[PDB]
Amino acid sequence: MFLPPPECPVFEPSWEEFADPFAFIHKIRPIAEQTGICKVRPPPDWQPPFACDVDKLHFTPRIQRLNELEAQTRVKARDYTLRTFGEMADAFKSDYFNMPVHMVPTELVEKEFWRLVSTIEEDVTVEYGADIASKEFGSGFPVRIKLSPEEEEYLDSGWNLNNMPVMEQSVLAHITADICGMKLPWLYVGMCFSSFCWHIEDHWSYSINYLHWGEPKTWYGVPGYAAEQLENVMKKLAPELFVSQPDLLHQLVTIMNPNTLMTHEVPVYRTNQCAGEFVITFPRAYHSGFNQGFNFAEAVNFCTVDWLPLGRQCVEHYRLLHRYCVFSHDEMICKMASKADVLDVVVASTVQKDMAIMIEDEKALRETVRKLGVIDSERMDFELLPDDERQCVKCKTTCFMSAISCSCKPGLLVCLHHVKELCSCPPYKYKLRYRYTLDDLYPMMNALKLRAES
Ligand SMILES: CC(C)c1c(-c2ccccc2)nn2c(C#N)cnc2c1O
Ligand SMILES: [Mn+2]
Ligand SMILES: [Mn+2]
Ligand SMILES: [Zn+2]
Protein backbone atom coordinates (compact mmCIF):
# COMPACT_ATOMS: atom_id res chain seq x y z
CA MET A 1 0.00 0.00 0.00
CA PHE A 2 1.07 3.56 -0.88
CA LEU A 3 -0.48 6.72 0.52
CA PRO A 4 0.23 9.66 -1.85
CA PRO A 5 1.67 12.76 -0.14
CA PRO A 6 -0.37 15.98 -0.31
CA GLU A 7 -0.15 18.05 -3.48
CA CYS A 8 2.38 20.89 -3.70
CA PRO A 9 1.28 24.46 -4.58
CA VAL A 10 0.32 25.21 -8.20
CA PHE A 11 0.60 28.74 -9.66
CA GLU A 12 -1.11 30.12 -12.80
CA PRO A 13 0.44 33.58 -13.32
CA SER A 14 -1.10 36.21 -15.55
CA TRP A 15 1.06 37.51 -18.36
CA GLU A 16 1.80 40.61 -16.26
CA GLU A 17 3.04 38.39 -13.39
CA PHE A 18 4.82 35.99 -15.77
CA ALA A 19 6.86 38.61 -17.65
CA ASP A 20 9.66 38.76 -15.02
CA PRO A 21 10.60 35.31 -13.66
CA PHE A 22 12.74 36.66 -10.81
CA ALA A 23 10.01 39.02 -9.56
CA PHE A 24 7.51 36.15 -9.75
CA ILE A 25 9.75 33.72 -7.83
CA HIS A 26 10.29 36.32 -5.11
CA LYS A 27 6.50 36.81 -4.90
CA ILE A 28 5.66 33.11 -4.39
CA ARG A 29 8.58 32.36 -2.05
CA PRO A 30 6.65 32.70 1.27
CA ILE A 31 4.27 29.95 0.10
CA ALA A 32 6.61 27.70 -1.86
CA GLU A 33 9.57 27.68 0.53
CA GLN A 34 7.26 25.89 3.03
CA THR A 35 6.83 22.98 0.59
CA GLY A 36 10.25 22.78 -1.12
CA ILE A 37 8.82 22.38 -4.65
CA CYS A 38 6.04 24.09 -6.59
CA LYS A 39 4.52 23.93 -10.08
CA VAL A 40 4.00 26.87 -12.49
CA ARG A 41 1.57 26.82 -15.46
CA PRO A 42 2.51 29.54 -17.99
CA PRO A 43 -0.18 31.71 -19.60
CA PRO A 44 -2.05 29.76 -22.28
CA ASP A 45 -0.47 31.40 -25.35
CA TRP A 46 3.12 31.13 -24.06
CA GLN A 47 4.03 28.14 -26.26
CA PRO A 48 7.68 27.89 -27.30
CA PRO A 49 8.05 25.84 -30.50
CA PHE A 50 9.44 22.31 -30.19
CA ALA A 51 11.04 20.97 -33.38
CA CYS A 52 13.70 18.28 -33.90
CA ASP A 53 14.70 15.44 -36.24
CA VAL A 54 14.29 12.28 -34.17
CA ASP A 55 16.76 10.40 -36.42
CA LYS A 56 19.65 12.89 -36.10
CA LEU A 57 19.56 13.41 -32.32
CA HIS A 58 21.48 10.71 -30.50
CA PHE A 59 23.02 10.01 -27.09
CA THR A 60 24.77 7.39 -24.95
CA PRO A 61 22.29 5.83 -22.48
CA ARG A 62 22.81 5.26 -18.77
CA ILE A 63 21.43 2.15 -17.09
CA GLN A 64 19.75 1.96 -13.69
CA ARG A 65 18.64 -0.73 -11.23
CA LEU A 66 15.44 0.00 -9.25
CA ASN A 67 15.99 -1.15 -5.62
CA GLU A 68 14.96 0.93 -2.61
CA LEU A 69 17.86 2.02 -0.32
CA GLU A 70 20.49 0.67 -2.76
CA ALA A 71 23.42 3.03 -3.39
CA GLN A 72 23.56 4.73 -6.80
CA THR A 73 26.15 7.17 -8.15
CA ARG A 74 24.78 10.58 -9.12
CA VAL A 75 27.23 11.15 -12.02
CA LYS A 76 28.59 8.11 -13.86
CA ALA A 77 28.38 1.90 -23.85
CA ARG A 78 26.18 1.91 -26.95
CA ASP A 79 23.99 4.59 -28.54
CA TYR A 80 20.31 5.42 -29.24
CA THR A 81 18.68 7.91 -31.56
CA LEU A 82 15.74 9.81 -30.11
CA ARG A 83 13.60 7.58 -32.34
CA THR A 84 15.11 4.23 -31.31
CA PHE A 85 15.06 5.19 -27.61
CA GLY A 86 11.37 6.09 -27.93
CA GLU A 87 10.60 2.79 -29.67
CA MET A 88 12.31 0.86 -26.86
CA ALA A 89 10.63 2.96 -24.15
CA ASP A 90 7.09 2.59 -25.56
CA ALA A 91 7.42 -1.17 -26.10
CA PHE A 92 8.77 -1.54 -22.55
CA LYS A 93 5.79 0.19 -20.95
CA SER A 94 3.09 -1.42 -23.08
CA ASP A 95 4.61 -4.87 -22.51
CA TYR A 96 4.96 -4.24 -18.76
CA PHE A 97 1.24 -3.50 -18.33
CA ASN A 98 -0.23 -5.25 -21.43
CA MET A 99 -2.05 -2.00 -22.27
CA PRO A 100 -1.74 0.93 -24.69
CA VAL A 101 0.51 3.54 -23.12
CA HIS A 102 -1.89 6.51 -22.81
CA MET A 103 -4.35 4.26 -21.06
CA VAL A 104 -2.12 3.45 -18.07
CA PRO A 105 -3.39 5.70 -15.24
CA THR A 106 -0.72 7.82 -13.53
CA GLU A 107 -1.95 6.63 -10.11
CA LEU A 108 -1.31 3.02 -11.17
CA VAL A 109 2.21 3.76 -12.45
CA GLU A 110 2.98 5.46 -9.12
CA LYS A 111 1.59 2.58 -7.04
CA GLU A 112 3.52 0.03 -9.12
CA PHE A 113 6.81 1.96 -8.92
CA TRP A 114 6.73 1.84 -5.13
CA ARG A 115 5.86 -1.88 -5.21
CA LEU A 116 8.67 -2.88 -7.57
CA VAL A 117 11.47 -0.95 -5.83
CA SER A 118 10.57 -2.59 -2.49
CA THR A 119 10.46 -6.29 -3.49
CA ILE A 120 13.73 -8.21 -3.80
CA GLU A 121 12.32 -10.73 -6.30
CA GLU A 122 11.89 -8.02 -8.98
CA ASP A 123 14.98 -7.25 -11.08
CA VAL A 124 13.74 -4.37 -13.28
CA THR A 125 16.37 -2.28 -15.07
CA VAL A 126 15.74 0.81 -17.22
CA GLU A 127 17.74 3.35 -19.28
CA TYR A 128 17.73 7.14 -19.71
CA GLY A 129 19.64 10.07 -21.20
CA ALA A 130 21.22 12.92 -19.22
CA ASP A 131 23.77 15.51 -20.41
CA ILE A 132 24.34 19.18 -21.12
CA ALA A 133 23.54 20.48 -24.60
CA SER A 134 25.91 19.51 -27.44
CA LYS A 135 26.06 19.37 -31.23
CA GLU A 136 24.72 15.80 -31.08
CA PHE A 137 21.72 16.80 -28.90
CA GLY A 138 20.98 20.51 -28.35
CA SER A 139 18.63 22.58 -26.18
CA GLY A 140 14.86 22.25 -26.55
CA PHE A 141 14.52 26.07 -26.49
CA PRO A 142 15.49 28.36 -29.41
CA VAL A 143 19.12 29.47 -29.52
CA ARG A 144 20.88 31.88 -31.88
CA ILE A 145 20.18 28.07 -39.45
CA LYS A 146 17.63 30.81 -40.14
CA LEU A 147 15.04 31.02 -37.35
CA SER A 148 11.29 31.47 -37.79
CA PRO A 149 9.51 34.50 -36.27
CA GLU A 150 7.96 32.14 -33.69
CA GLU A 151 11.43 30.91 -32.64
CA GLU A 152 12.75 34.48 -32.60
CA GLU A 153 9.89 35.43 -30.26
CA TYR A 154 11.27 33.10 -27.55
CA LEU A 155 15.02 33.73 -27.97
CA ASP A 156 15.21 36.33 -25.19
CA SER A 157 12.42 35.11 -22.90
CA GLY A 158 13.33 35.01 -19.23
CA TRP A 159 11.79 31.51 -19.10
CA ASN A 160 14.00 30.22 -21.93
CA LEU A 161 16.32 28.34 -19.58
CA ASN A 162 19.40 29.26 -21.64
CA ASN A 163 18.86 32.89 -20.58
CA MET A 164 17.99 32.36 -16.88
CA PRO A 165 21.65 32.27 -15.70
CA VAL A 166 22.82 35.35 -17.58
CA MET A 167 20.10 37.77 -16.54
CA GLU A 168 20.81 40.81 -14.32
CA GLN A 169 19.21 39.19 -11.20
CA SER A 170 21.26 35.98 -11.16
CA VAL A 171 24.49 36.05 -9.11
CA LEU A 172 25.97 32.87 -10.61
CA ALA A 173 25.76 35.06 -13.72
CA HIS A 174 29.30 36.46 -13.55
CA ILE A 175 31.33 33.64 -12.07
CA THR A 176 34.24 33.84 -14.49
CA ALA A 177 35.40 30.32 -13.70
CA ASP A 178 33.86 28.02 -16.29
CA ILE A 179 31.56 25.81 -14.21
CA CYS A 180 29.68 23.79 -16.82
CA GLY A 181 27.39 22.29 -14.18
CA MET A 182 25.82 25.48 -12.81
CA LYS A 183 25.22 27.83 -15.74
CA LEU A 184 24.43 25.26 -18.43
CA PRO A 185 21.08 23.44 -18.69
CA TRP A 186 20.86 19.65 -18.50
CA LEU A 187 18.69 17.62 -20.90
CA TYR A 188 16.79 14.56 -19.55
CA VAL A 189 15.32 11.86 -21.83
CA GLY A 190 13.05 9.62 -19.74
CA MET A 191 11.26 6.28 -19.96
CA CYS A 192 8.73 4.59 -17.65
CA PHE A 193 10.17 4.12 -14.11
CA SER A 194 13.50 5.93 -14.76
CA SER A 195 14.06 7.73 -11.47
CA PHE A 196 16.05 10.59 -9.95
CA CYS A 197 17.24 9.69 -6.42
CA TRP A 198 16.85 12.02 -3.41
CA HIS A 199 19.20 15.01 -3.61
CA ILE A 200 19.71 18.74 -3.15
CA GLU A 201 21.51 21.02 -5.62
CA ASP A 202 25.19 21.98 -5.41
CA HIS A 203 25.78 25.04 -3.17
CA TRP A 204 22.06 24.79 -2.15
CA SER A 205 20.99 26.63 -5.31
CA TYR A 206 17.50 26.92 -6.78
CA SER A 207 16.58 24.81 -9.79
CA ILE A 208 13.90 25.15 -12.50
CA ASN A 209 12.74 22.30 -14.80
CA TYR A 210 10.60 22.49 -17.97
CA LEU A 211 8.90 19.44 -19.52
CA HIS A 212 9.04 20.06 -23.29
CA TRP A 213 6.85 17.08 -24.28
CA GLY A 214 5.83 13.51 -23.48
CA GLU A 215 4.25 11.70 -20.56
CA PRO A 216 4.32 13.25 -17.07
CA LYS A 217 7.16 13.48 -14.54
CA THR A 218 6.17 12.62 -10.94
CA TRP A 219 7.93 14.60 -8.15
CA TYR A 220 8.36 14.43 -4.36
CA GLY A 221 9.72 17.43 -2.43
CA VAL A 222 10.70 18.43 1.13
CA PRO A 223 11.05 22.03 2.42
CA GLY A 224 14.51 23.40 3.16
CA TYR A 225 13.80 23.67 6.89
CA ALA A 226 13.49 19.85 7.16
CA ALA A 227 16.74 18.96 5.31
CA GLU A 228 18.64 17.71 8.37
CA GLN A 229 15.57 15.84 9.63
CA LEU A 230 15.48 13.93 6.31
CA GLU A 231 19.22 13.25 6.45
CA ASN A 232 18.94 11.76 9.96
CA VAL A 233 16.25 9.35 8.74
CA MET A 234 18.38 8.25 5.78
CA LYS A 235 21.52 7.83 7.93
CA LYS A 236 19.60 5.50 10.23
CA LEU A 237 18.22 3.36 7.38
CA ALA A 238 21.10 3.52 4.82
CA PRO A 239 24.39 4.32 6.58
CA GLU A 240 26.45 3.14 3.59
CA LEU A 241 25.49 6.35 1.75
CA PHE A 242 27.11 8.63 4.34
CA VAL A 243 30.73 7.44 4.22
CA SER A 244 33.20 10.11 3.12
CA GLN A 245 33.51 10.44 -0.66
CA PRO A 246 36.86 10.69 -2.50
CA ASP A 247 35.69 12.92 -5.37
CA LEU A 248 32.70 14.97 -6.42
CA LEU A 249 32.23 12.15 -8.98
CA HIS A 250 31.61 9.67 -6.13
CA GLN A 251 28.44 11.06 -4.52
CA LEU A 252 26.02 8.33 -3.40
CA VAL A 253 22.21 8.74 -3.61
CA THR A 254 19.21 6.44 -3.23
CA ILE A 255 15.51 5.71 -3.79
CA MET A 256 13.36 5.95 -0.65
CA ASN A 257 9.57 5.72 -0.25
CA PRO A 258 8.14 9.10 0.87
CA ASN A 259 5.77 7.23 3.26
CA THR A 260 8.90 6.30 5.23
CA LEU A 261 9.77 9.99 5.61
CA MET A 262 6.17 10.86 6.57
CA THR A 263 6.16 8.10 9.21
CA HIS A 264 9.17 9.87 10.77
CA GLU A 265 7.46 13.31 10.80
CA VAL A 266 9.23 14.69 7.70
CA PRO A 267 6.87 16.81 5.53
CA VAL A 268 6.67 15.63 1.90
CA TYR A 269 4.68 17.01 -1.06
CA ARG A 270 4.01 15.56 -4.54
CA THR A 271 3.03 16.66 -8.05
CA ASN A 272 2.62 15.33 -11.60
CA GLN A 273 4.39 17.74 -14.01
CA CYS A 274 2.77 17.62 -17.48
CA ALA A 275 4.19 18.80 -20.80
CA GLY A 276 4.36 22.61 -20.94
CA GLU A 277 4.69 23.06 -17.13
CA PHE A 278 7.59 24.18 -14.90
CA VAL A 279 8.67 22.83 -11.51
CA ILE A 280 10.82 25.04 -9.22
CA THR A 281 12.89 23.72 -6.28
CA PHE A 282 14.01 26.05 -3.47
CA PRO A 283 17.39 26.20 -1.64
CA ARG A 284 18.25 23.00 0.32
CA ALA A 285 14.89 21.42 -0.67
CA TYR A 286 15.32 17.65 -1.12
CA HIS A 287 13.56 16.15 -4.13
CA SER A 288 13.16 12.82 -5.98
CA GLY A 289 10.83 11.28 -8.55
CA PHE A 290 10.33 9.18 -11.67
CA ASN A 291 9.14 9.43 -15.26
CA GLN A 292 5.74 7.99 -16.26
CA GLY A 293 6.87 7.20 -19.82
CA PHE A 294 8.85 8.52 -22.80
CA ASN A 295 9.49 12.27 -22.26
CA PHE A 296 12.01 15.13 -22.63
CA ALA A 297 12.85 17.76 -19.97
CA GLU A 298 15.38 20.60 -19.57
CA ALA A 299 16.61 22.04 -16.24
CA VAL A 300 19.06 24.64 -14.88
CA ASN A 301 20.38 25.81 -11.51
CA PHE A 302 20.21 29.47 -10.50
CA CYS A 303 20.92 31.80 -7.57
CA THR A 304 18.98 34.94 -6.61
CA VAL A 305 19.83 37.64 -4.03
CA ASP A 306 17.66 35.77 -1.52
CA TRP A 307 20.09 32.84 -1.82
CA LEU A 308 23.33 34.74 -1.03
CA PRO A 309 23.42 34.19 2.79
CA LEU A 310 22.43 30.53 2.27
CA GLY A 311 25.33 30.10 -0.14
CA ARG A 312 27.77 31.24 2.56
CA GLN A 313 26.14 28.88 5.09
CA CYS A 314 26.44 25.99 2.59
CA VAL A 315 30.21 26.40 2.17
CA GLU A 316 30.58 26.40 5.95
CA HIS A 317 28.53 23.18 6.06
CA TYR A 318 30.73 21.68 3.32
CA ARG A 319 33.80 22.50 5.46
CA LEU A 320 32.40 20.63 8.48
CA LEU A 321 31.82 17.56 6.26
CA HIS A 322 35.10 17.75 4.24
CA ARG A 323 33.07 17.96 1.02
CA TYR A 324 34.47 19.51 -2.18
CA CYS A 325 33.17 22.85 -3.54
CA VAL A 326 32.12 23.52 -7.12
CA PHE A 327 33.33 27.15 -6.90
CA SER A 328 34.64 29.65 -4.34
CA HIS A 329 31.79 31.69 -2.83
CA ASP A 330 34.16 34.44 -1.66
CA GLU A 331 35.72 34.63 -5.14
CA MET A 332 32.24 35.23 -6.60
CA ILE A 333 31.51 38.01 -4.06
CA CYS A 334 34.81 39.77 -4.80
CA LYS A 335 34.28 39.48 -8.57
CA MET A 336 30.91 41.22 -8.24
CA ALA A 337 32.42 43.95 -6.03
CA SER A 338 35.05 44.60 -8.73
CA LYS A 339 32.15 45.18 -11.17
CA ALA A 340 30.00 47.28 -8.81
CA ASP A 341 29.32 50.02 -11.38
CA VAL A 342 27.36 47.62 -13.65
CA LEU A 343 25.41 45.67 -11.03
CA ASP A 344 21.69 45.86 -10.52
CA VAL A 345 21.23 48.18 -7.53
CA VAL A 346 19.32 45.58 -5.49
CA VAL A 347 22.05 43.04 -6.24
CA ALA A 348 24.68 45.57 -5.13
CA SER A 349 22.89 46.15 -1.81
CA THR A 350 22.69 42.40 -1.05
CA VAL A 351 26.29 41.66 -2.08
CA GLN A 352 27.43 44.51 0.20
CA LYS A 353 25.81 42.83 3.23
CA ASP A 354 27.47 39.46 2.57
CA MET A 355 30.82 41.19 1.95
CA ALA A 356 30.61 42.86 5.36
CA ILE A 357 30.22 39.45 7.04
CA MET A 358 33.08 38.01 4.97
CA ILE A 359 35.44 40.85 5.93
CA GLU A 360 34.73 40.60 9.66
CA ASP A 361 35.15 36.81 9.59
CA GLU A 362 38.46 37.16 7.72
CA LYS A 363 39.77 39.78 10.16
CA ALA A 364 39.18 37.42 13.11
CA LEU A 365 40.77 34.40 11.38
CA ARG A 366 43.91 36.38 10.47
CA GLU A 367 44.27 37.54 14.09
CA THR A 368 44.00 33.93 15.31
CA VAL A 369 46.69 32.60 12.97
CA ARG A 370 49.03 35.49 13.88
CA LYS A 371 48.68 34.46 17.53
CA LEU A 372 49.72 30.92 16.54
CA GLY A 373 53.09 32.26 15.34
CA VAL A 374 52.61 32.72 11.56
CA ILE A 375 54.50 35.96 10.82
CA ASP A 376 55.61 35.97 7.16
CA SER A 377 53.04 36.80 4.46
CA GLU A 378 52.75 37.38 0.69
CA ARG A 379 49.97 38.29 -1.73
CA MET A 380 48.79 35.40 -3.91
CA ASP A 381 46.37 35.45 -6.90
CA PHE A 382 44.34 32.36 -5.92
CA GLU A 383 42.01 32.73 -8.92
CA LEU A 384 44.86 31.71 -11.29
CA LEU A 385 45.36 28.27 -9.71
CA PRO A 386 43.41 25.26 -10.95
CA ASP A 387 40.85 24.24 -8.34
CA ASP A 388 42.57 20.97 -7.42
CA GLU A 389 45.68 23.02 -6.59
CA ARG A 390 44.02 25.26 -3.99
CA GLN A 391 41.99 22.89 -1.78
CA CYS A 392 42.60 22.69 1.99
CA VAL A 393 44.49 19.46 2.77
CA LYS A 394 42.14 18.81 5.73
CA CYS A 395 38.63 19.98 4.81
CA LYS A 396 38.93 20.24 0.96
CA THR A 397 37.51 23.79 0.81
CA THR A 398 38.47 25.89 -2.20
CA CYS A 399 40.73 28.68 -0.93
CA PHE A 400 40.49 32.30 -2.13
CA MET A 401 40.67 34.92 0.65
CA SER A 402 43.74 33.30 2.31
CA ALA A 403 45.62 30.09 3.07
CA ILE A 404 48.78 28.83 4.82
CA SER A 405 51.80 27.37 2.99
CA CYS A 406 55.16 25.92 4.06
CA SER A 407 58.27 25.38 1.94
CA CYS A 408 58.71 21.98 3.59
CA LYS A 409 55.53 20.71 1.82
CA PRO A 410 55.71 22.50 -1.55
CA GLY A 411 52.37 23.09 -3.24
CA LEU A 412 50.18 22.10 -0.26
CA LEU A 413 47.74 24.55 1.37
CA VAL A 414 45.47 24.66 4.42
CA CYS A 415 42.65 27.11 5.08
CA LEU A 416 42.91 29.27 8.19
CA HIS A 417 40.72 26.90 10.25
CA HIS A 418 43.33 24.11 9.80
CA VAL A 419 46.75 25.69 10.41
CA LYS A 420 47.79 22.72 12.57
CA GLU A 421 47.10 20.17 9.77
CA LEU A 422 49.73 21.22 7.20
CA CYS A 423 53.05 19.70 8.36
CA SER A 424 55.24 19.11 11.41
CA CYS A 425 57.32 22.29 11.02
CA PRO A 426 56.91 25.08 13.57
CA PRO A 427 54.57 27.92 12.48
CA TYR A 428 57.34 30.51 12.05
CA LYS A 429 58.32 28.58 8.89
CA TYR A 430 54.80 29.17 7.47
CA LYS A 431 53.56 31.96 5.22
CA LEU A 432 50.12 33.55 5.14
CA ARG A 433 49.13 33.78 1.45
CA TYR A 434 46.35 36.36 0.97
CA ARG A 435 44.41 37.74 -2.00
CA TYR A 436 43.66 41.19 -0.51
CA THR A 437 44.73 43.32 2.42
CA LEU A 438 41.97 44.63 4.66
CA ASP A 439 42.81 48.05 3.18
CA ASP A 440 42.05 46.74 -0.34
CA LEU A 441 38.72 45.29 0.82
CA TYR A 442 37.01 48.27 2.47
CA PRO A 443 37.05 50.41 -0.74
CA MET A 444 35.63 47.46 -2.70
CA MET A 445 32.69 47.28 -0.30
CA ASN A 446 32.27 51.08 -0.51
CA ALA A 447 31.83 50.91 -4.29
CA LEU A 448 28.89 48.56 -3.74
CA LYS A 449 27.39 50.98 -1.22
CA LEU A 450 27.63 53.91 -3.65
CA ARG A 451 26.03 51.85 -6.43
CA ALA A 452 23.27 50.71 -4.06
CA GLU A 453 22.50 54.14 -2.55
CA SER A 454 21.38 55.73 -5.84
C1 LIG B 1 16.03 10.04 -14.44
C2 LIG B 1 16.85 11.22 -15.01
C3 LIG B 1 16.71 11.28 -16.54
C4 LIG B 1 16.52 12.54 -14.33
C5 LIG B 1 17.52 13.10 -13.43
C6 LIG B 1 18.91 12.61 -13.28
C7 LIG B 1 19.77 12.55 -14.38
C8 LIG B 1 21.09 12.15 -14.22
C9 LIG B 1 21.56 11.81 -12.97
C10 LIG B 1 20.72 11.89 -11.87
C11 LIG B 1 19.40 12.28 -12.03
N1 LIG B 1 17.25 14.17 -12.73
N2 LIG B 1 16.01 14.77 -12.91
C12 LIG B 1 15.55 15.88 -12.22
C13 LIG B 1 16.18 16.50 -11.10
N3 LIG B 1 16.63 17.03 -10.20
C14 LIG B 1 14.31 16.12 -12.76
N4 LIG B 1 13.98 15.19 -13.71
C15 LIG B 1 15.02 14.37 -13.78
C16 LIG B 1 15.33 13.17 -14.48
O1 LIG B 1 14.37 12.69 -15.24
MN1 LIG C 1 13.76 -4.09 -7.74
MN1 LIG D 1 17.56 18.29 -8.84
ZN1 LIG E 1 40.39 23.64 5.97
Ligand SMILES: [Zn+2]
Ligand atom coordinates in the same frame (compact mmCIF):
# COMPACT_ATOMS: atom_id res chain seq x y z
ZN1 LIG F 1 56.77 22.31 6.90
